[PDB]
Design a binder for this molecule. Structure first.
Ligand SMILES: Cc1cnc(NCC(F)(F)c2ccccn2)c(=O)n1CC(=O)NCc1ncccc1F
Lengths: 11, 250, 26
């Protein structure tokens, strides 16, 4: 149940 | 954390969350010791028995958080890892001896009211504070029972005599560990639990009012079980390796 | 500057349970 973190970090 | 309580805002600015990218989930706790280095438990990254072997690009470090699941915009900072260092003599085969690891961040993180490094003990501080009966503090977003907290939890636990630690388990205990927790007859309780691993065990020096990290949440048998105690990596005992790595790769 | 919290030691404010720790260092 974690809130979506910015794709800018997952890139 | 079992039998703990909600932490206050900015109460543990060195608390770090080890976050897994895919799937997105809480892996472990960790601590900020400088603007570029994070300290955690080696078993959070490597543990062959459970096929665990995370690399740099598999994780993310989240600093300055309070809420476990929410993305705290404008408050927390997420960082990538440049390199991971696990103690060369980490014993994952037997008792997690030397359960320690360092993580070099891609870029230095900026400090703030919610992000601040904890101190590493010097020989004297360690000698005078690491004594049975003396209390330390443990923090983490781990399970509340052997379900999950909304915000960072905190619990203060007393350090326990080595003999008692030894006699509570069948596991071979080394000088690189120490245990903490209340005895079954002391009334109060509390302990770390799954998800808290790698987190900091800190103490406040009555000499200079600074907070020092004396241990790392390492292992235990169950959580808050009577007659059992949590075991922590003895940070000072391994400071030689810590210093060696930092001034040789930082 | 390590170990001194911006919202506590820096402002001379104590958190709600640090006293328990200090009292144990008898
Ligand atoms: C990786 C791991 C494997 N086995 C654990 N416990 C079982 C054991 F105690 F018998 C043990 C200790 C050392 C090596 C193998 N097995 C353990 O505690 N961890 C680490 C862990 O899960 N730590 C979390 C934790 N830390 C302190 C208290 C409770 C708690 F869940």
């Amino acid at each position: 149940d974690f809130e979506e973190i910015p794709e800018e970090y997952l890139q | 954390i079992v039998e703990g309580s909600d932490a206050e805002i900015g109460m543990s600015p060195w608390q770090v969350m080890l976050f897994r990218k895919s799937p997105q989930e809480l892996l472990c706790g960790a601590s900020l010791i400088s603007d570029r280095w994070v300290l955690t438990a080696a078993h959070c990254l490597l543990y062959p028995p459970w096929d665990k072997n995370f690399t740099e690009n598999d994780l993310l470090v989240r600093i300055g958080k309070h809420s476990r699941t929410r993305y705290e915009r404008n408050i927390e900072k997420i960082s990538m890892l440049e390199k991971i260092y696990i103690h060369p003599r980490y014993n994952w085969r037997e008792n997690l001896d030397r359960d320690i690891a360092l993580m070099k961040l891609k870029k230095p993180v900026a400090f703030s009211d919610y992000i601040h490094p904890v101190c590493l003990p010097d020989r004297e501080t360690a000698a005078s504070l690491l004594q049975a009966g003396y209390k330390g503090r443990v923090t983490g977003w781990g399970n509340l029972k052997e379900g999950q907290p909304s915000v960072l939890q905190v619990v203060n636990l007393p350090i326990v005599e080595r003999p008692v630690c030894k006699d509570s388990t069948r596991i071979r205990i080394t000088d690189n560990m120490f245990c903490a927790g209340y005895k079954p007859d002391e009334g109060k309780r509390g302990d770390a639990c799954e998800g808290d691993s790698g987190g900091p065990f800190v103490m406040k020096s009555p000499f200079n009012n600074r907070w020092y990290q004396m241990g790392i949440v390492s292992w235990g048998e169950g959580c808050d079980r009577d007659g059992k105690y949590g075991f922590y990596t003895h940070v000072f005992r391994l400071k030689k390796w810590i210093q060696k790595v930092i001034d040789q790769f930082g | 500057d390590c170990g001194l919290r911006p919202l506590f030691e820096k402002k001379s404010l104590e958190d709600k349970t640090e006293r328990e720790l200090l009292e144990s260092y008898i």
